[PDB]
Design a protein around this ligand. Sequence first.
Ligand code: FES
Ligand code: FES
Ligand code: FES
Ligand SMILES: [Cl-]
Ligand SMILES: [Cl-]
Ligand SMILES: [Cl-]
Ligand SMILES: [Fe+3]
Ligand SMILES: [Fe+3]
Ligand SMILES: [Fe+3]
Ligand SMILES: [Xe]
Ligand SMILES: [Xe]
Ligand SMILES: [Xe]
Lengths: 327, 315, 316
Amino acid sequence: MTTADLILINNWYVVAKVEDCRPGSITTAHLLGVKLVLWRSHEQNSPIQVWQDYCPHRGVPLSMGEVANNTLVCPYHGWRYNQAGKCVQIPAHPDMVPPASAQAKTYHCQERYGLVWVCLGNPVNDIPSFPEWDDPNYHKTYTKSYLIQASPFRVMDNSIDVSHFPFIHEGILGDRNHAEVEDLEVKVDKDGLTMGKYQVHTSKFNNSTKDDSMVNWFRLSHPLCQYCSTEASEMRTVDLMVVTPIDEDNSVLRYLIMWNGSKTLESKILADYDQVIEEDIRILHSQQPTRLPLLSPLPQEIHVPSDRCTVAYRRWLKELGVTYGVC
Amino acid sequence: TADLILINNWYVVAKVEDCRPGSITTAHLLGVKLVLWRSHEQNSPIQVWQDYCPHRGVPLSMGEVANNTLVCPYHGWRYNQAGKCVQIPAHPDMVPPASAQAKTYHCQERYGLVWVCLGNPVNDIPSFPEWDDPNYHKTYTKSYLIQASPFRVMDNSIDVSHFPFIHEGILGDRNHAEVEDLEVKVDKDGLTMGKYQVHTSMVNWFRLSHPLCQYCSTEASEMRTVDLMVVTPIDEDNSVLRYLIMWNGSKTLESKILADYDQVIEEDIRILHSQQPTRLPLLSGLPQEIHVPSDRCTVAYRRWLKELGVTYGVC
Amino acid sequence: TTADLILINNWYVVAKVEDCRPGSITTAHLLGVKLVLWRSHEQNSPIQVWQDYCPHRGVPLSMGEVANNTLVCPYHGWRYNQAGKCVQIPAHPDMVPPASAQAKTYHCQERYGLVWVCLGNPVNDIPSFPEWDDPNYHKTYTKSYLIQASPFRVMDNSIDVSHFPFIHEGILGDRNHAEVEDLEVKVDKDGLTMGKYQVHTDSMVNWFRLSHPLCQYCSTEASEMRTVDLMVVTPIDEDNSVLRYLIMWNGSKTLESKILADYDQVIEEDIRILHSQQPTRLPLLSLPQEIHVPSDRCTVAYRRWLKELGVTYGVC
Ligand code: FES
Ligand code: FES
Ligand code: FES
Ligand SMILES: [Cl-]
Ligand SMILES: [Cl-]
Ligand SMILES: [Cl-]
Ligand SMILES: [Fe+3]
Ligand SMILES: [Fe+3]
Ligand SMILES: [Fe+3]
Ligand SMILES: [Xe]
Ligand SMILES: [Xe]
Ligand SMILES: [Xe]
C-alpha cells in the first residue's frame, strides 16, 4: 500500500520502455511507494506482467528469481507463479494444491507508444493521447531514464515553467536579452491544461541559416504527462514527457520525441534534450521544500503574471485532490 | 531496549583467541556498546563492560590497560577489574566517588568463545557434547555481519526446504525438492527437529536450547559432523553469525568444511538481506506470511518466541 | 527555528572577513538556517547575510551571481538589491516587484576580522576584545574546524582544564603534573569567569571569561610573553559546530606558525574526544548520568548558566 491519493493510484503511469523488457526478462521498478517486478515469458510477443516485488511465503523479492515455463519462480523455495499471480506449484509438496493465499499482488499493465504503463488501482482514467504516433511522416526516439531527487509534481511544474528559458537554458531555448515574457494563454477545461501558442526565442548558431523562430504549445490531460508541440523553420517536433512518481520526493523523467525532418537529426535531438533536462535537474535538486507548494492566502511562493500556467497547475492539483508529493 | 528474557541469556560476542592479555576489544550486544579488556598477566580474566566512562561520556575502549586497570583517555580515571574507579589523577588523595563505577556484565569463556550476559544469568551456556570428545576435531568459521534481524537469521537456519534452490551445490538437488513429514518438539530443552534426509546420503537433526543458539548433527557415510551456531544480536535489525564445527573424520578436511560452510552462509545472507520486513513476523503494505506443512519447524520457532515474550527483533 | 530566543537574539561568527572577498557568494549555516553571504566589487562593500532562499520558486540564492550591487537568482533572474528588495524581474521589465519579493535579511556586523550575524534582534553586543586595538600584539586566525558535536559540548570541552595532562601532553601538561589546584570560578550577571591557574610547561598562568555562552576570551602569561585568544563557536544546529580562534600575542612574529601548529594539535586532540562523547548534546544538571569531581567546578557552572538562560537547543 501507500500514503498516495486515489486520484493518483487510479491513473496510468510509465514505469519502463517495451525495448527494456525482453522475452524471459525480470525488471524492477518503483511506483507510488510500491516495489514492482516486471516479467515476460520466453515466448515472443509475450505479455508483460507487473506485480508487487514480494513473495508472500517468507518475504523474498520475486525479482530475484527466474522465469521458467510461463511462471515466475521465487529463489528461496521455488514457488511457481502463473501469469495471473497464482502459485501453481510448491516443490516441497508437489502433489498439493497451493493455498489460495499464495497469490502475487498484480497490477494493470498496458503497452502504448513503446512504453509500459501501469495502474496500481482501478484504471478509470485513460492513457494520454499522442496523435503523431501512427503518422509515418514522423520518426520516433526515446530519451534515457533520468532519476531525479525531487517531487514528481515539482518536475512537472518546471516543465510547465517557460520564463526560466533565457536563464538556465540560454543557447538552446532562450536569449538572456529577449527575456521579457508576453501575456500567456492558458486554458482550464475538459481536455485539461493547455498552454496556447507562444514564441520561443533561440540563439542563432548557424549564421548561414535563417532565424529558427520556434512556436510551442503544450497540453496536460494527466498531471504527470505533458504533450508538447514545436513548429520551427522546416520541422515540427512533438514529444510526450512522462514522469514516474517513485515516491513523494523522488521521480523518473522520460521523453518520447517525434519529428517530421531527417532521421539523421536523432543524435542532435537527444543531445539537446540532455542539456536542457540536466540544466533543469540542477534547479529541481536545489529547490525547497522538495514537495510542490500548493496555493494559500519558509515564506509562501510568489506568483507574477508569467507564472499563469504554473499557478493553474497548482490549482488543478488541489481540484484533483492531490496531497502526495505536495505541501 | 531488549526483553528481559533475552537480557538474561548468554551470547557469544568474540573468540577467546582475539582477547589477548593487555588487549582492549569492542562488541555490540542488545543495543549496548561493550568494551572487553584483559590485564597483561597470563591467565588474566576477561572484563566485559559497557563502553562508557561515567565522568564525561567518553568510550573506555579509546583508553589503555595499565597495572590491572583500564584507564579512561580523557581525565585519566583508573578502573579496577571489578570496574570501580580507584584513582582520579586530578585528586590523587581523594577516594573516588562510589558513582565512579563502570557498568559491568557477566563474562564466561566456553568452547573458545567469549560469552556475555547483560542481565542475570538464569540459564547456563548451551551444551556442546563433542567439545569433550577427543575423537572430534575443531574449527571455527569467521564472523559474518548480517543486516537482518537476529531472529530472521535463526529462522533461515531452521528452514530445511530452501536447500534444493539456494544450496544446490552442497545441501540439495533440484530432483529431490520434496520435503518429508518433519518432526518438531518444543519442550523445556527448547526446539528440536527430528532426523531427516538431506540429498547432496546424509541424515541431519538439530536442537535449539536458546532462541539464538543452534546445535546441529549430521551423519554421512564415514563421518559425523556437528556444529554450534551462535547468533549475536547486535540490535533489532543487525546480527553476527559464528559457527564451531566439529567432525570425526580426517583433520585434512578442515579447509573443504570451511569452504562449504562459507558458500552456504553467503547464499543464505543473500536471501536474508532481501527479506521484508527486516524483523521476523510472528504468528498472529506487505501481505501476511503463508505457512505450508514443510514450514512446521519455523512455525514452531515463531510460536516459541511469542510464548517466551520476545518483542525485540520481531514484527 | 526550534532554537531558544536567548540564542536567536545573540551574535555569532559564521565566517572570517578574509573568506568573503569583494563580489563573492559564500554559504553558511546557523541554528538550522541556511545563510547566503554576499559582497560587492565596491573596494569596501558591506557583507549581506540573508537566508539562502529565493521566495519565488525556492531556489538557493547562493547559486546565483553578484552583479551591479545586486544578487541575481539563477532560475528567473530576479535581482535583489543590498537591502534585499527585489528591484528587477526580467519577465515583466516595467513592473515594480511586489513588496513580498524580498529576501529575508539578517543583522550583520564585521568585528575582529570576523562576520557576526544575529538571526533575531541583537539585545546583547558582540563580545569584547581589548588587545585588538593594542599595537604591541600581532594577530592570527586559525582555520574553521567542523565538529560533529553540540556547540555546547564544544564549549564544555574548552572550559575543562583537568584533561590537559592526558590528551594535550606536550603542549598544556604532562602525565606527571595531573593534580588540579583549587580553581577560582566566578558566576555572575556578566557571565562565567575562571580565575588564574597554573598550566604545566616550566609553567604558564592562564585565565578565561565567558560573557557569551558560545564565545570565550582567554589570557595566558608566560616568560614575559602574553598570548590572548577569542574562541568562537558557530552553532550549526543542535548536533554540529564550527570552531574558530583569533589569537593575539606580544612576542615574535616568527612564533605565528608555531602558535597555529600548537593550536591545531590541541584542537584535533579535543575533536577526537568530542566526536566520541555520548550523548552528542550537552547534559545539564538535574546512558549513565555525569559524575562531577572538584576539578569540574567551572564545567558544572557552565551547565548551571545554560539552564538559567533556558537553553534547550543542543543540550540533553
Ligand atoms: S519465500 Fe518465495 S517460495 Fe519461500
Ligand atoms: S571522561 Fe573518563 S575520566 Fe573524564
Ligand atoms: S526562483 Fe528565484 S527567480 Fe524564480
Ligand atoms: Cl517462459
Ligand atoms: Cl541462546
Ligand atoms: Cl566572553
Ligand atoms: Fe527547463
Ligand atoms: Fe540455508
Ligand atoms: Fe583541550
Ligand atoms: Xe528541448
Ligand atoms: Xe554446510
Ligand atoms: Xe593551545
